[PDB]
Every structure is written in structure tokens, then in C-alpha cells.
Symmetry: D2
Subunit: 306 residues, 4 copies
């Protein structure tokens, strides 16, 4: 049938929440693919039963065979080592292997890369998979901004979705948080600062907390995978349902912000044709300087990956 087929290359914790959410949303049939024997079959089985509770009809199957990429409409890559620069060349080899299978089996698939550092790994996969530049993106800004939006919303006592914000350049510690592009119910945050509903010092603390959220969660003896999963699914859904949402993602830069031949975080429009638009924020020189540091770091790590 013409249900979408969504292959999750990597069936760890992020993969398991993604599968759950796809069934909840009835977005398409799911393949949980992993190198680990049998585990993806077990998670798939568990997840499949939830069709009953969710009033859905999505197949959820496990896979240890790359050829199950055949016919994929969407491919979401979480596979890779996480236990530092030394992992860069190992994760490059994984992107290479996956890219070759995408090129062979599903060259028209829309690809979302999650493996860190994402702004590096997405470009490596782009290059090895051969897909068009509008058909591959990395998870970054939707996740990082979810934190900033959420934290401001709790301070202001408003619905989380009503705070909008932009974090660009790269995922990770060089992420560029743009104070000037925060709004609350579409109103500039500065009005709420002028009114003393939130202070500059509070926002600085919230910015630091945002940058350091993954660390804060790890130091609490948990690990971040629920928000990453939800962010990816928001992206995947925008593509699949042709919503044309403006979502901040890692995408190929072709001159925006003065940068070419590299991937970086920026608002894009995701619909049925993939990345339909790349939006270039009209950054000032001070914001562009931080954007430049983010790109420099992506480049440093990209060189080590080879």
C-alpha cells in the first residue's frame, strides 16, 4: 500500500520512542533496524501491539538486514558510537556504510541524521548517499529551541508552543542562541523584559541552561532521548504530511551567512519536496561572529573524521 515506509537506522532509546510516536500518530509503517541481533524484533513486537490502543494501523517490524531500506520514504539515522574526537572516524565509517545502502536501496528517501556531531555526520551521509541537498537534514534546532522555548514559557506562565526562538549555526556547545529572535505569542521578548515580567539576568541563566541541557540530564543519571525523538518526528511529520513548517535544522549552506560547502543549523521549510526553502536570518555582525565559530568547529571535526 502507499502508506509511507519509515526506516529507523538504529533501534536504541531514541529509535524506540520514535517508533512509539509514529504509531500514536499513524504516520506510516516502521522498520526498527539495528546491527544488534534480535533486539529490534523485540521492540518492534512490543510497539506493534499499541496499534490497538492508538486506533492505528502501522506495521512495526525489526530488521538486521540493510536491504530492508528498499522502498523507504523516510530514513532516520541514530546509529553510531557515543563512547570525543576519537569517535569521529568510526562514525564516519558508519555513515559511509549507511550511505552506500541508501544509494543502492532508497535513493529517493528523505533522510534525517541524528548521530553526533550532527552537523558533521549529516554532510558525511549526504556525500556518501548521493541524495539531493533538499532531501537530507540533521536534527539540531528543533531540539535545542524546545528547551529554550519551554524554559521561557514556564517563567512567563504561557503555553510552551507560544514561545518561539532561534538557535542556529550548529547543534552542541557552539550553538548560537539569538536573543533578538525570541517571541511570546508573536510579541518580541524585549517587551516582556521592558515590563519586568522577565529580566535579562534570568534570560542569561535560561540560555546557559539551554546550552547545557543534555549535560544537565546526564548529570541527573538519565539520558536525553524523549525530546530528541519528538523533535525528529515533528520534522518527519512535516515532510510526510506536507505541512511546510518552519523548523530549524542542519542543512547544506550555499552562501547563507557567508558559508558554503558545509552544513549548519538554520530555519528551513519542510514539506513534500523536502527542504523547500532555506531561510537566512538577517544576522548582525556580532551574531554572525558566533555563527562563524560554530561553523569553524563543525569544520575542525569534519577534518578529523576522514
Amino acid at each position: 500500500a502507499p502508506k509511507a515506509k519509515i526506516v529507523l537506522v538504529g533501534s536504541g532509546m531514541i529509535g524506540g520512542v520514535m517508533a512509539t510516536l509514529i504509531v500514536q500518530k499513524n504516520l506510516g509503517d516502521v522498520v526498527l533496524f539495528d546491527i544488534v541481533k534480535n533486539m529490534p524484533h523485540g521492540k518492534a513486537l512490543d510497539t506493534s501491539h499499541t496499534n490497538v490502543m492508538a486506533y492505528s494501523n502501522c506495521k512495526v517490524s525489526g530488521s538486521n538486514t540493510y536491504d530492508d531500506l528498499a522502498g523507504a520514504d523516510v530514513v532516520i539515522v541514530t546509529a553510531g558510537f557515543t563512547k570525543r574526537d576519537d569517535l569521529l572516524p568510526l562514525n564516519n565509517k558508519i555513515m559511509i556504510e549507511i550511505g552506500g545502502h541508501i544509494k543502492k536501496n532508497c535513493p529517493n528517501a528523505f533522510i534525517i541524521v541524528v548521530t553526533n556531531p550532527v552537523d558533521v555526520m549529516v554532510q558525511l551521509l549526504h556525500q556518501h548517499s548521493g541524495v539531493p541537498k533538499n532531501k537530507i537534514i540533521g536534527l539540531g534546532g528543533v531540539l535545542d529551541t524546545s528547551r529554550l522555548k519551554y524554559y521561557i514559557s514556564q517563567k512567563l506562565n504561557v503555553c510552551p508552543r507560544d514561545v518561539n526562538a532561534h538557535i542556529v549555526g550548529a547543534h552542541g556547545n557552539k550553538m548560537v542562541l539569538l536573543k533578538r529572535y525570541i517571541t511570546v505569542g508573536g510579541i518580541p521578548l524585549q517587551e516582556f523584559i521592558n515590563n519586568k515580567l522577565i529580566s535579562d539576568a534570568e534570560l542569561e541563566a535560561i540560555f546557559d541552561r539551554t546550552v547545557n541541557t543534555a549535560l544537565e540530564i546526564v548529570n541527573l543519571h538519565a539520558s536525553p532521548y524523549v525530546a530528541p525523538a519528538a523533535a525528529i518526528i515533528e520534522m518527519a511529520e512535516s515532510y510526510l504530511k506536507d505541512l511546510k513548517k518552519v523548523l530549524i535544522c542542519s542543512t547544506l549552506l550555499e552562501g547563507q551567512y557567508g558559508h558554503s560547502d558545509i552544513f549548519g543549523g538554520t530555519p528551513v521549510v519542510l514539506g513534500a519536496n523536502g527542504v523547500e526553502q532555506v531561510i537566512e536570518l538577517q544576522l548582525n555582525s556580532e551574531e554572525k561572529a558566533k555563527f562563524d565559530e560554530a561553523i569553524a568547529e563543525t569544520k575542525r571535526m569534519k577534518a578529523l573524521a576522514h
Copy 2:
């Protein structure tokens, strides 16, 4: 049971779409109240069957008795003559009658007034119902801005919800459209103008179309009730589910924009305590002048109503 009870005072076209949507969203039990004998019972019956299709369990009942206001959590008033200044005193008498029944039967209800001109009728109902100022609002800005947001979104090829905009002061022809407070994916619209993705002249046409939308629909031999209904339900849902959405509604001004003792359109925060916050936009003198004209017109009509 502690399901919310939602009484629709007026069971015309807007009332019928509201009932449908409440069932679709499983928001609470519905009473379709009207002065017209038997018709609300028929619409209620029709609507009740949709619980099966929607997987919901909301009672939908008709009523020709004001005492069915008893126990209402939410009251939505669409009743009133629509077939001009001459209707003002007639509609005042209807607000008076309804207000007396609210005071008697459901003084703790959250009230949404729709009857036009809304910025007048809401204050009349406020005064006769005796409810607190945080417990009554009028439909205006959510509906007017839905048009502006939608039209920009189609020009820019982005998800409609990703355009945010502010229209304040009053509903109707003196509505104040604030170009400066339009954003796209949280980005100032001016960036899209600077980039030539949309022109100033296009936006002027879209503003005119926005102001004149109800007229445009009437002149096409239809009448606006689906968007009005959806806008009201977004408001009602924010209250019922304590979402704390920032939504532009007609609310009592107590000094904001230099105005007191009158209702006017402005962003508010709607949650479990009703109007939790009134947000005052930091308008410039030119925007404040148009806000003043809107209020003057509400006042002119309020005087004729008595």
C-alpha cells in the same frame, strides 16, 4: 460527572459547528440552547451520533429553557439579531436577559460573547451577568488574525500556524492591523520583505482583504461561521485544558493603551483562571491613534445600545 458542561446560548450556524467541534475534541457535554422551539433538539440529536465516529463521549442536548444554564462551566453567546445601529438596543435587551440567567444559574461560568458588535455586547453582558472581569471575553482577534495569518502563509508557502500576527482594538471595520507584529516561523516579516519574498504592496492588499473578509464571504453568497466557530473553540479549549495560550480577545481594559472602563481587543493568556494575563503591546503613537479610533467607535455604539 466532572466533565465540563458547555452551554451554547444560540443554536444557529455558529452554534452547530461549535457543537460538532466539541464532540470531535471530546471537550465536554454540550447544551444547544435557543429561543426557537425544537430546532436545537434536532441539531443536538444529529450531532450526538458523531460520538461514535469520533471515539468521544459527550452528551449533546437541545434546550428551550434558560434554567439549563445551571452548572455550566462555559457559556458561549451567539444569540442576537443580525437584520446597523438600530439592532443595538434590541441586542442590549438580549444581553440583559442572558446576563440575568447567568447571574442566577451559573455565576462561576467562563463566558465567551460572539454577538456583534462584540466589543460592545461583551461589556453589556459583563455588566448584567455580574461575573468577574477575568471570566468574560469576546471573540475578535483570534478570528481576524486567522485570516491575516492564513493569507500570508499561502503567499509564503509555509504552514498557516507558523505565521503569527496581531490585530487589536476592536473586531469589525476599525480593527487595528499591526504590520510591525507579524512574524513567520518567529522571524520578523520585514526580513521577508527585505528579501523580496513578499512586497509591501502585496501586504497592503492582504490587510484590506483581512478587514473585508466577512463582506467578501457574504458577497460570495455564503456566510462566515466555520472560522468563527473554530476560533471560539480554540479559546474555550485553552480555558478548559489550562493551556495558557496567548490569544487576542476582547477584554476589560483598565488603563492599557490609555483606556479604562471599556472592552477592546488585545492579547490575553487564557487558562484555568480565565484571563490570567492581559498583555499590553508597546504600541507607537501612530498605532495608538488607530487603537483610539477603534475604542471611540465601540463607545459610540455602546451609547446607542442603552
Copy 3:
């Protein structure tokens, strides 16, 4: 884009609720087509604004041109005179005209016929449109059973969806209500009768009320269109999302119940390939006798239509 295109041939009351629901559910782009000049454009405009409230991105456009059928994935026909056997030949001519346009413009569309008497009009459209037998159905059983299910659920104080029931043969006054195939939470209704939670006499009253529901609503000075609309959308959604729901619809019989070369109501499975399965209930002789009377009446009216 590969969003589904859904053309509503007829933009009256049922058409307007269908458009609303499609946007609410983000099911696809909508064309409101009608013979009446300009009205469908006005309803379409009104409906389009609700994308903002619903977080959807469905185009809603009006049409007075049959060639807008081009590219339709789903076509829903409500057009036809309702103001009796004399209307039969007039409505035949309308089905003929529509069928010719479907054959020309969208021969691979999935078709849902609503125009009454539906078990006649669906076969007339089938014959003139040339579509495959698995690609056209009529609204009947989902709507009639929604009433029976709802009324039992209110008596038993259970969730409406948890009552399941079968009404077969035809829509309208010869509909066959099958007491033996009613369940509550998957349990035979007879257990609830044995327990005295519901009596045989109560059920007889509920059966009569079911058969006479459209009349009951009309006699209350309303008209049935909200439940019809929701029922159609449940059918359309099952097709579009490949849900494979078991839904009772008017479909071509090829020997089931002893009948061929005629359409009649029976459970079918609706998924991406249209009618994937026709389910033949193992009726006893007394139930088959009533099924036969329903078919006889469809045949009597089909003869008058030509």
C-alpha cells in the same frame, strides 16, 4: 504535492461539514464543487482560515467547473434533488453527468456516493463513471449504525464506540437491523438482556427510533447533516490512511446473500485498495428475508430511475 485531493461534488450542508472535518484532520486538499455560482468559493474561504486553529495545511477552494475533478484521489457526491419517486430520473441524469466527468478527469479516484436513495444512485454512478467495483461505495451502514450504537450506549452508560452493530441491505426505511449482531465491549448484547441491564422492549423502541431518526430530526425542524458528514469522513479516512476498518457500506454484490448485479449494504474493509474485502454475514432465513425486501425496493427504484 502528493497530499490527497478530495473533491466534494455538492457544497451544501453535508459538504460544508465534510470540508471542516477534512481540515481538522489534515486529510488533504479540498475542492467544494457546486452548480451554484460563487457559494462554494465563500464556504471554501471561510473553511480555509481554520487551518490556523487546527495546525493544518489543507487548501480549500471552491469550484463551478467539472474539470477540477482532474487529479482527484477521492470524490464524494452529495449533489442531487431532494424536493419521492419522481426525483429518481432527475437524480439519474445528475449521476450520468458526474460519471462522465469522473471517467474523463479522475478514473482512478475512490468514489463515495451519498445522494439518495443511495443504494440506487451508487450503482448508477458506478455504471456511468466506469470505475472498478472496489473503487465506489455508498454511505449507509456507518450512519444508520451510529444511531443504534449511540442509543444503546446511552442506555447502558458505556462509551458509544464500544457498542458495535450491523444494519444491512439498504439505507432508508427497509434497512435491516440485526439484533443478533449487536455487542457491547465485544460482548453479545443478549448477555445484557439476560442480566436485565436492557430489555427486549427497550431494544425494539431503539430499533424503531433508529429506522426513523432522519424523520425525527426533520420533525424537530432540523436536518441531518453532521452525522452523515462524519460517517463519510470516517470512510474516506479509512481509504486515505489505509486503516482497513470494517465499515458497513453500499457495495456491489456478486452473489452474497443470494444477490448479484445490485448494490446493497454490508460490512466491507476499506483501505488503500478501496474495498479490499466484502464481508458476507451468515444470516439466517428470517434475516435473509428482510435483506431480500431491501434489495427488492432498491430494484423497484432503480427501474423508475431510467
Copy 4:
């Protein structure tokens, strides 16, 4: 605010999926409580960010303090050792501790027990918490039947939700699968057997697979928590939204099936008053014999627990 407060006593894998789903569904504020220091705070933080993606406004907080039970509307207990009869007295002590805190802090809460063996642990908690018999249930039948329903649905190529089935007596290996109470689109499964769409031998294999599903998943090197979580949330939602769904759960028997003073699995109706109805299936002597074996085993383990 009058948002529901839902405390998850136990923040392991099932707890983490439950929190995710509550946010997705905007069902209420969540407390992830656990004995383990800091981990629930980390999962809570991760989960909280998803409010942005989900358009929700649910607080998600961690807790290592039992007094955070105060004001709970719903309490879901997953805490307990899983690494056999020897764990019975340890898990009894945990139920005792939790029960004392419920009695003190939230005696009007609706309680769902998950800890295994559930039909034992639920009664232990009932006894120590002091709550009314209509306010505490155990997870069993919704989960076990999700498997049976799902597996039949895939064989028959129908929507999973359209298969309904009953598994009673107890959760675990003595669960009673009732072939006679399986339906497909409300039609007796026997009709599909008579038609050769599914064989008796196939169903026997599906029954075995159902009983052994948790084992099958564990033997695939995964563990069951996604379906358990979804099943619990379906139950919790029915209560919170007063849906009055018929759901098979472990509940106090007071003579049904010849059993008193023990908990066992049976269809109940869950709404705003908790267990509003206990439905007693009219089992035959052969089915009652298996129901008796299930109860005997619950009793054997209950004796060892003390």
C-alpha cells in the same frame, strides 16, 4: 489549576513511556516518583521539553519524596522488584509502604497497579491504601488482549481496533483466553473460521503466542514496556475523560464467577466514578473451570506474599 495530577510511583521504562504519552495527550501534570535519587528528575526534564512539539501544557517533574502524592488524582504503581515467588514478600512490603502514603496524602485518588503479579499486588495495595473498591484496578486484560487483537488483525488484514477479544481471570500464564468472545468488526470470529479466512489451528497458535508474548519479547533481548504503558494510559484516560470504556482489568470480585474477596480480570466500565460497572461474562462450565485455576494461582501467591 484543576488540571489532573498524575503520579507515577516508579520511573523506570514503563514510567518513562507513560509520561511521554500523557504529554502527547495533554492529560495532566506528571510526577515521576522513584526511590532512585535524581534519575526521575532527568527523565522529567527530558520529557517536559516535548510540550513544545506536542502543543501541550503539562508539567513534568521528578520526585524522591512520597509527600508529592498530595493532591494526586491518579496514581500508577510500577515500583517493585522483578529479579519468582521469593519476590512476593518484598513486593508486599513495597505495596504496604505505598498504600500508607496514599491513605495519608491522596485517599481520593484513582489507583492503577502494574507491579506483578498484578492480581495479587493490586489487592495488597487496596487493603493497605484504604481506598474504595471502585477506585483501584490492575493492568491485565487491556494489555493481554492487545496482543490477541493485534495478531488476529494482521492475519485477517483488518484494522487492529476492529478485533475485540476477552482474556479474563488473571494476568500472567493462567490468563483465560475466551475464543467464544472474539469478534471482527463486531462479527463473531466463528464466521471467519466457517469461511476459511482463518483456521482453528492458526487461532491456537495465536493463543499460545498471546500467552507467551512477554517471554517472546524477553527472548528477543528486549523487554515489554511500550504496550504496557499504552494500555495503562488508555485506562487512565478513560477515567480522567469520563469515556466509560469497557476495558478488561483486575478488580475486586464480589460473587462474579463464583468468586469473592479476591481480585481478578474482567471487563469493567471506567469513567469519572472509577469502576462504574463490573461486567460478568456468562461463561460456560469449561471456561469457568479455567477462570477457577487463575484465581487459585492468585490465591497461592497472595498467601506467600504475607
